Amino acid sequence: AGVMTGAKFTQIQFGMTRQQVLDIAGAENCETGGSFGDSIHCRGHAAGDYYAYATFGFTSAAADAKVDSKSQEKLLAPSAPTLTLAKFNQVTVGMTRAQVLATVGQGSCTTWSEYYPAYPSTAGVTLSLSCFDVDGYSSTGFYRGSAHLWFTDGVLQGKRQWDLV
């Protein structure tokens, strides 16, 4: 039914059960247990020395637990990457998500990880964005100009970049 994709990732919602996640992702693409504990890890196409993928975390190990975390690498492409080293250096800790996006570009980022430690409450939500420069995103190889920006409760807590110019 095809490998894991960005479209499937977007369809999966916080609060869904394990079966709902599996039915959308395609069970053949996913695994649980082992190095992933009770999370469900689903693979997309081959990329680098591994694959593009999504990992879904749950409130518990129960068969009816709910998704409280969604993470992915290389399944979603930025819509209009305009990040540059200059813009990255203007981002400051304490900025809201809106200020950050106005600084690095509205379409330069995708969501890397989003977790609700107090699900169903949204308090304490942690969010990591992966942002890219004009040619930095690669869904099959290695990035060539990217940054990681992370937030707690919608406020930037830190940032790191690689190969931005």
């Binding site: 890890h41 020395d49 690498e73 990681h148 807590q157 690689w162």
Partner: protein
């Protein structure tokens, strides 16, 4: 066997790039076949086996413990971190980090392990101390996969990687327990379409693959029939513009020849 060499040359033609190849007898340490044994190639993730070998040496020395939990944060995460990203809130033990780095090529796992031994410079010092004056690690993940042509950073030579791997797996360098632990991690799941795809039932294989920029791809392995390893094989290529499928294919075919003419 000469037929394998024919396949290696064919690979260079298909890929339009250099291929480095070594088959080493595990017991005697003699070179059975070689092609460009002394040219440099980017190690990519294959260096993670040497990294964990260095970690195990510290464990043997009582300066590190397999069960020591390492806590890290968002600042530590880098591209290709499936296992470490999942465990961010709980931390991971040294043992789990080596498992992640070797079996899943988790990049953050390798960086965290690198920090535990003092960085690239100290991994290189470790290699130097065991007689490898060729292999060098200069950068962290993910930059070490850049593979800029003619750049010697983060490179090894087929013959050096093969000899060093032999020393780690059969030498007195590591205690027997640690040698087995290293092998167990390598025996465990992202290299299926490479040498494993041509392995007959019952054969043993402990491998570690790597991929990098500029068509870089490689694999190091200890393999042998009837559940025991008897040869080390190292295969590296860099410079090709062929697709990943094509690169995987060529390596698998060299592997098919190697087994056929075992």
């Amino acid at each position: 066997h000469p037929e394998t060499l024919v396949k290696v040359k064919d690979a260079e033609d298909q890929l339009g790039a250099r291929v480095g190849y070594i088959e080493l007898d595990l017991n005697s340490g003699k070179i059975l076949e070689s092609f460009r044994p002394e040219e440099r190639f980017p190690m990519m993730s294959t260096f993670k086996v040497l990294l964990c070998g260095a970690v195990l040496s510290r464990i043997d020395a009582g300066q590190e413990q397999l069960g020591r939990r390492i806590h890290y944060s968002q600042n530590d995460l880098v591209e290709y971190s499936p296992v470490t990203e999942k465990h961010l809130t709980d931390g991971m033990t040294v043992r789990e980090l080596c498992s992640a780095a070797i079996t899943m090529s988790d990049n953050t796992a390798a960086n965290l392990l690198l920090t535990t031994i003092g960085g690239p410079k100290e991994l290189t010092a470790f290699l130097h101390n065991m007689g490898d004056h060729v292999t060098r690690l200069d950068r962290w993940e993910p930059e070490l996969n850049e593979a800029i042509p003619n750049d010697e950073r983060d490179t090894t030579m087929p013959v050096a990687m093969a000899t060093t791997l032999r020393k780690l797996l059969t030498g007195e360098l590591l205690t027997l327990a640690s040698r087995q632990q290293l092998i167990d991690w390598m025996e465990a799941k992202v290299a299926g379409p490479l040498l494993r795809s041509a392995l007959p039932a019952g054969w043993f294989i402990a491998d570690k693959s790597g991929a990098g920029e500029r068509g870089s791809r490689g694999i190091i392995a200890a393999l042998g029939p009837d559940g025991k390893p008897s040869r080390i094989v190292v295969i590296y290529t860099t410079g090709s513009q062929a697709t990943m499928d094509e690169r995987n294919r060529q390596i698998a075919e060299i592997g098919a020849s190697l087994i056929k003419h075992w």
